[PDB]
Design brief:
It is classed as cell adhesion. Keywords: Myelin, Cell Adhesion, Signaling. Two copies of one chain form a homodimer. Chain A has about 475 residues and is mostly beta strands. Chain A has no helices and 43 strands. The radius of gyration of chain A is 58 Å and the shape is rod-shaped. The complex binds a molecule of 5 linked components (NAG-NAG-BMA-MAN-MAN) (2 copies), a molecule of 2 linked components (NAG-NAG) (2 copies), a molecule of 2 linked components (NAG-FUC) (2 copies), 2-acetamido-2-deoxy-beta-D-glucopyranose (NAG) (6 copies) and alpha-D-mannopyranose (2 copies).
Chain lengths: ~475, ~475
């Protein structure tokens, strides 16, 4: 064929271990030299910039940095130029060329080369993404390019997780050989932050080389930091703490009835409320959402607040003998117990309810006065008041009399009615006496519901003059004869 | 003797009546003419201004205005020259001279003369001042200078008043003769404005001559126009009229308690008052004072006015079981009757007096409230009011109870006290239960004197928990166990 060669671009091995560079070449078969010499140049392609001579046919003189370190296996004449370099060191790490010397002026340095790496750490391969709910395999590749010292592998930090599987050497890249060791297992949620290692050793040696890798397992957020059902006062400070444990940043959302609130991405979100109201009462949900799974957890916040200042509707001023409905409303957050009562007497008692109604069958006069409505509760109590002032058909009280002093005669009659009662006296006075004695006579006064009135007849002997009292308003009329107590 | 004559300066007589001029003369007695002539000149003393010749000896020729009107009586030779002139007339009224004619160049007109008045009205003389309490005499003089026609007198408008006294002729002035007629009587108070007359006549004639005079009698003021005892309202118009009847201007004085007021001099003085006050009430005196006597008359003015707005002193806020004095004062001009009373009951009644006191023996709670004080009177009535608010050692009313609903148990206890009562509940609750059910419990309220309070024990079975109520103020303390009515 034509000129040309075959050599693996990349080759690697450990410290103190031999390498075996696979090499093959071609030259015009037209020439058949009986003696074929060859040279292994280091770090440089052109002879012009003098490179270290790794090996030369029929010549012991090489570079002093390769003296006793290298030797060629197999005749060149059979197109075989594989090379062995034992006991490596980091200086020897570089690029290697092969130049051929057959005949004269037919000396060719081949362009295609091989690069020598000198690594003392094995190569571990792990999947880009490790899900906590899928089966995962991790490999440990070690570059065995030495047939005399065959390396053996070890798994450090295995912690069970099933047996390690083993392979012989596989055909890595272009003709190079590598012993691989794979591990097959399925992670949990604790697999993250774990350390996995791979060791390599040889029988007759004190050489031991090791490599590491830390796992990044992706688990779905499961909410741990979640406080339960709470009860807080209005105005007080409310601190809800929501925490999710996911290795991928879990999208944490605070929501209620479909509201945005504070949406954020972290391991723990705070939700603060001040001036708590009955509107903020109820259920708050925290959703931990991740591309590997989701978890929602909910809490109940009961706002405990003293009952509102009560309000009362219904009738207030009705007639006598009628029906009266009084409706008392209150908006409390914890079940309020509320009672309504008159001065000295208690009327209606409702237990654990929002509002209370009281009905009155008929109105006796006494049902006038002011009543009270209290809303009692565990955390506080407020109240309100309402005057029931009914309408009356005038009632002349029997505290009424006619006292007779000797010289002059006087009477006292009292009534009670809601509107002011036009009051009057009637009397049987013998004959007709005008401008005699007195003509101005009586006087009257009122306090609240009571209308007191006093009569005074002047110059009347103890001869008992009968006296009658009458009272009218817009509703009723009453008349009554008064008795004697004096003399 | 020497030259000279004697003749009355003034002589007077009526119309148609003769006059007799008394005349005497003297001349040096050395000459004795045997023939003595004489002449009576009129109106002029000197012959130079030719005067009318009234008479001439041995000569009929006289003035034509004296022709047949005059004649001389008695011889001149006996020194007598008295002359008579009959049938007079107003022209002849003038001054008369006498001139003597004895011998030659011994002709003398005498300087002293006589003047002839011709009056047809008699002369009445009355005292300068005529007192109604003294005896008075009035004269009527008439000049009788005619011996042939002797005049006689008459009293016209005599009206009794006693007899007229009569005199003969008296010797008026210098030798002239006058018939006088005097009247003696004593006047009254009506004598003023009376008319007194004097007439004179002769027997054989139609001649009658008359004269007049009006009396000015001075009487002491006797008060006629005087209204009696009166009663008038304050603010009203008061008109006092005081009249005196005295012919001399009576000094009228309005006085009271020794005060000047309106002093004036007339027949009737007005005294006006407006905005009458209790200070102008009382006795007013009118004095009619004259230099001929005096008279005082008095009146009583009572001011009738509605009683003043009453004022009350004494205690107002005392303790329980104590004594209370309430003094109510009023200043009324007519005797006021006044009463004080409580709402519904009457307390004190005083009749026709200025002020009224009420005492209270002990104070029962009910003696609290507001009382009224009225001052009633014929012309009007005003009033005032006062709150008696006493102090109480707290009283727990027996409107108190313990109603037991099935689910929950509630109580109601009420007291009454003047200062606010610190109120409390005591109860036997088995074991000790704190923060269980309720810990706020009770509620209380107050109206006026009443302190209502309600208890509420929550979650207590119908197993009846006994309940006690206590109340303390600065005065007393009470405790009481309440009973069951529900279930
Ligand atoms: C160019 O030429 C070279 C050789 O000149 C070829 O490369 C290889 O060179 C290595 C030298 O290190 C040879 O490895 C040796 O293998 C011997 C046994 O060969 C095996 O294969 C035959 C198959 O016919 C089997 O029957 C046999 O049982 C073997 O499994 C061993 O004797 C040597 O190892 C000894 O020492 C080690 C420890 O040091 C022990 O583990 C061994 O048991 C033994 O005692 C040695 O390792 C290898 O054989 C050569 N390969 C070939 C194919 O010849 C290149 O291939 C060639 N290239 C070109 C392009 O021509
Ligand atoms: C100057 O002289 C004259 C007389 O010349 C004197 O004046 C008097 O004159 C009058 C004449 O009118 C004389 O009056 C007459 O009176 C006669 C009676 O005299 C009375 O007196 C004597 C007293 O001796 C009594 O006795 C006697 O009774 C008489 O009472 C009457 O006769 C005359 O009146 C007759 O007429 C009338 C009516 O006309 C009748 O009423 C008579 O009754 C009677 O009929 C006459 O009136 C008077 O006498 C003379 N007086 C005197 C004193 O002589 C002067 O006095 C004198 N003066 C001086 C200074 O010398
Ligand atoms: C309810 O009734 C009371 C009287 O019983 C009304 O008036 C109060 O009376 C007290 C006297 O003890 C006064 O000191 C208060 O000032 C009064 N209140 C007011 C607002 O003036 C009261 O007004 C009545 N209320 C209603 C709503 O009818
Ligand atoms: C006397 O008592 C009355 C109450 O009984 C006092 O107050 C009056 O109460 C009525 C309610 O019906 C109010 O409408 C009046 O306005 C109140 N009066 C005043 C002046 O405020 C009253 O004040 C008491 N008087 C005295 C002198 O103690
Ligand atoms: C009292 O309530 C009134 C409304 O009446 C109530 O509601 C209607 C729909 C019916 O159910 C009826 O039976 C109820 O009584 C209001 O108009 C009024 O403003 C209210 N007043 C107060 C004090 O809240
Ligand atoms: C009530 O009168 C008081 C005076 O007291 C009275 O007069 C004295 C001299 C004694 O006679 C005593 O017994 C009387 O009670 C006054 O100080 C007070 O201002 C008066 N108040 C009124 C309301 O008028
Ligand atoms: C040492 O190497 C020899 C090869 O010469 C091998 O047979 C032997 O098993 C090895 N022994 C140890 C202990 O490494
Ligand atoms: C959550 O509720 C519990 C009651 O079980 C309470 O003790 C805790 O303090 C609450 N924590 C937060 C953060 O609200
Ligand atoms: C909440 O989680 C439950 C799992 O029990 C799931 O069925 C539901 O769909 C989730 N809801 C949301 C809004 O993510
Ligand atoms: C008249 O006058 C004479 C005198 O001559 C006298 O006597 C007589 O009384 C008189 N008579 C009357 C009526 O006048
Ligand atoms: C005087 O008093 C009487 C009452 O007798 C009365 O009628 C009269 O009008 C009063 N006159 C005056 C001027 O006051
Ligand atoms: C009033 O008149 C009487 C007469 O009865 C008299 O005594 C008294 O002094 C007179 N008083 C005065 C002040 O003039
Ligand atoms: C190597 O040298 C030249 C390169 O073109 C050719 O004649 C032939 O490929 C030979 O083998
Ligand atoms: C009248 O005349 C003269 C006046 O002096 C005197 O000689 C005498 O008085 C005589 O009578």
């Amino acid at each position: 064929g034509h000129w040309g060669a075959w050599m693996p671009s990349t080759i690697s091995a450990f410290e103190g271990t031999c390498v075996s560079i696979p090499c093959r070449f071609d030259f015009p078969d037209e020439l058949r030299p009986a003696v074929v010499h060859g040279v292994w140049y280091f770090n440089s392609p052109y002879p012009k910039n003098y490179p270290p001579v790794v090996f030369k046919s029929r010549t012991q003189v090489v570079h002093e940095s390769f003296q006793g370190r290298s030797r060629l296996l197999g005749d060149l004449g059979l197109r075989n130029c594989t090379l062995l370099l034992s006991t490596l060191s980091p200086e020897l790490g570089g690029k290697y060329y092969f130049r051929g010397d057959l005949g004269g002026y037919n000396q060719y340095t081949f362009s295609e080369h091989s690069v020598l790496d000198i690594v003392n750490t094995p190569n571990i391969v792990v999947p880009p993404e490790v899900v906590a709910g899928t089966e995962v395999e991790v490999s440990c590749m070690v570059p065995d390019n030495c047939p005399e010292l065959r390396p053996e592998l070890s798994w450090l930090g295995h912690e069970g997780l099933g047996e390690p599987t083993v392979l012989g050497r596989l055909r890595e890249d272009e003709g190079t050989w590598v012993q691989v060791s794979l591990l097959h297992f399925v992670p949990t949620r604790e697999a993250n932050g774990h350390r996995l290692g791979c060791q390599a050793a040889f029988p007759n040696t004190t050489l031991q080389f090791e490599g590491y890798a830390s796992l990044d397992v992706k688990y779905p957020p499961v909410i741990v930091e979640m406080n339960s059902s709470v009860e807080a006062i209005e105005g007080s400070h409310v601190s809800l703490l929501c925490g999710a444990d996911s290795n991928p940043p879990p999208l944490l959302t605070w929501m209620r009835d479909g509201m945005v609130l504070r949406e954020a991405v972290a391991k723990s979100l705070y939700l603060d409320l001040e001036e708590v109201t009955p509107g903020e009462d109820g259920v708050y949900a925290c959703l931990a959402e991740n591309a590997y799974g989701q978890d929602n957890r909910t809490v109940e916040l009961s706002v405990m607040y003293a009952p509102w200042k009560p309000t009362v509707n219904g009738t207030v001023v009705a007639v006598e003998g009628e029906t009266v409905s009084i409706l008392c409303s209150t908006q409390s957050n914890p079940d309020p117990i509320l009672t309504i009562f008159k001065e000295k007497q208690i009327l209606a008692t409702v237990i654990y309810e929002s509002q209370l109604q009281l009905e009155l069958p008929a109105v006796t006069p006494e049902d006038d006065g002011e009543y009270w409505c209290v809303a009692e509760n565990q955390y506080g109590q407020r109240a309100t008041a309402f005057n029931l002032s009914v309408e009356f058909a005038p009632i002349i009280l029997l505290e009424s009399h006619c006292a007779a002093a000797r010289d002059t005669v006087q009477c006292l009659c009292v009534v009670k009615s809601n509107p002011e009662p036009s009051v009057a006296f009637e009397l049987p006075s013998r004959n007709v006496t005008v401008n005699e004695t007195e003509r101005e006579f009586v006087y009257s006064e009122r306090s609240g519901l009571l209308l007191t009135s006093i009569l005074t007849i002047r110059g009347q002997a103890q001869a008992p003059p009968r006296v009658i009292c009458t009272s009218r308003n817009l509703y009723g009329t009453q008349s009554l004869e008064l008795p004697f107590q004096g003399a």
